[PDB]
Amino acid sequence: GSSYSMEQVEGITSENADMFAVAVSLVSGKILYISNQVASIFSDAKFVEFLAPHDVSVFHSYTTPYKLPPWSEKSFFCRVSVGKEIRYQPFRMTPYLVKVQLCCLLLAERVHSGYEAPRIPPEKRIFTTTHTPNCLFQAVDERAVPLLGYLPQDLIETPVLVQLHPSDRPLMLAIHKKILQAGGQPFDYSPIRFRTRNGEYITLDTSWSSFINPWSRKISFIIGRHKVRVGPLNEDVFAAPPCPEEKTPHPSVQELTEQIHRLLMQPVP
Amino acid sequence: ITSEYIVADMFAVAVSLVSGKILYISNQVASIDAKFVEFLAPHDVSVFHSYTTPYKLPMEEKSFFCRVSVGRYQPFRMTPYLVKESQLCCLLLAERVHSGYEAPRIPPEKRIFTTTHTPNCLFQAVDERAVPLLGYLPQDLIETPVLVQLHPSDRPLMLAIHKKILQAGGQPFDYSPIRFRTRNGEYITLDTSWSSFINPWSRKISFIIGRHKVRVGPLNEDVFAAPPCPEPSVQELTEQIHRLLMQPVP
């Protein structure tokens, strides 16, 4: 029972040159309050209009009322652009429910490729991935965005094998065999090459594990903890690839995929 | 060409992955070419699209559900198959879903379903068996607050259950009755077995899994029917259970 609004929405973080705050009407979608420095790192309309069209559905999902925590991790990513081809910049955002009418304030921080000053120490370039037996990503942890160039939503529900170098795909078959064989005990395997947003591959040192349904004994998820031992040749992992986007065919990928899923259908006694 | 290969009460269709409805077959349900999604319920069109995007279409039969129109809407379990130098289609096997408490009622001991949710207490999944027994399709519960679904009375018991879940380190345990709201608005009573999936490196819980047995169904056997009633403490409570789960083990 408290409405900040007006200037009470103040709480500068600068004193980051890459952050900004914004309050958005939960009913209108209109930008009620917008923090300064925005034009710097680059209005008054619907905030979604400045987001990549693919990230709009994402923004609404994570800003849904029955979610979010009242102002006194639950953060998502969005590419923002002050119009223009158009130029976007990835932003990590944390949503907070706040009254002005109850809206939603968000702290947005510009994200930087972990391969460029300030470069993420190699011993800490660690991210994890989770996937279902059908081999489609289920989640990618936040540490992955800076090391891959993709935002979580770009990889969720897509073939795991597609991101792997074509010569490291058949390896996945043996990796899963050991995974259900290991019955949950993590094990190392390297190197595996994983494709980033800019079409460049990074070399990973991976530890594999699985979550086993105790009642059915069937594997529910495959979890990997990755350490990028060799980053890409081009440090800006968010740039675009000079290749005609992705595709659909995936001749061998489909084959290898169903082959693995079949394998993971067996109970792990 | 092969129409209705794998097979009563259930029909089939083949849809162009570029346009609409090519093949359709034997109708049967007592009640009476274009885009297939036109017949689907609005809120399921996205579901149908998602489960039929080419890079997902290929046993256990990893299907999905959605309501098709009549005249009225009925729940259907559909299994998508990618049938291919000419036309690339998606062969869909359909099958009317019957209330678990209806004529073909599921035997007591078999009225079992499971649920999974993330530390933030929002459903990440609900298995196939949950539909016939609860009236909801997975898409209705996914990403929604698990607490909102429990009887307002049983809600507090959820803070205790999670604490034990934390203390259990993965060891499953049975819990007294908890009341779960079904689609038609009625509460069913459950005998629940709880467990968790612990990330092996950070030792934090990634998913809470529950296996439920329905020991008391609803008075109105038709669980898919609409609820005879309109559609903060839950928000706050959720924040407690959420905070609590940030603790490692061990």
Numbering used by the authors:
A (entry chain A): 168 to 182, 187 to 213, 221 to 250, 265 to 276, 281 to 296, 305 to 473
B (entry chain B): 179 to 185, 188 to 212, 222 to 247, 263 to 275, 283 to 295, 303 to 449, 455 to 473
From the paper:
To provide insights into the PAS domain interactions of PERIOD proteins in the mammalian circadian clock, we have determined the crystal structure of the mouse PERIOD2 fragment mPER2, which includes the two PAS domains (PAS-A and PAS-B), the αE helix, and a short extension N-terminal to the PAS-A domain. The mPER2 structure was solved by molecular replacement using the refined dPER structure as search model. The structure revealed a noncrystallographic dimer, which, in contrast to dPER, is mainly stabilized by interactions between the PAS-B β-sheet surfaces that pack against each other in an antiparallel orientation. Interestingly, the PAS-B dimer interface includes the conserved Trp419 (corresponding to Trp482 of dPER) of both monomers as a crucial interface residue. In the homodimer, both Trp419 residues are 80% buried because of stacking interactions with the preceding Pro418 as well as van der Waals interactions with Ile427, Arg429, Pro390, and Ser413 of the dimerising molecule. Overall, the PAS-B dimer interface is predominantly hydrophobic and also includes two centrally located phenylalanines, Phe415 and Phe425, which establish stacking interactions to their noncrystallographic symmetry mates. In addition to the PAS-B β-sheet interactions, the mPER2 homodimer is stabilized by interactions of the PAS-A domain with helix αE and the PAS-B domain. In molecule 1, the PAS-A β-sheet surface is covered by an intramolecular interaction with residues 170–182 located N-terminal to the PAS-A domain. Notably, the αE helix of mPER2 contains a nuclear export signal (NES) comprising residues Leu460, Ile464, Leu467, and Met469. In contrast, the single mutations of Trp419, Ile427, or Phe415 in the PAS-B dimer interface of mPER2 to Glu disrupted mPER2 homodimers under gel filtration conditions.
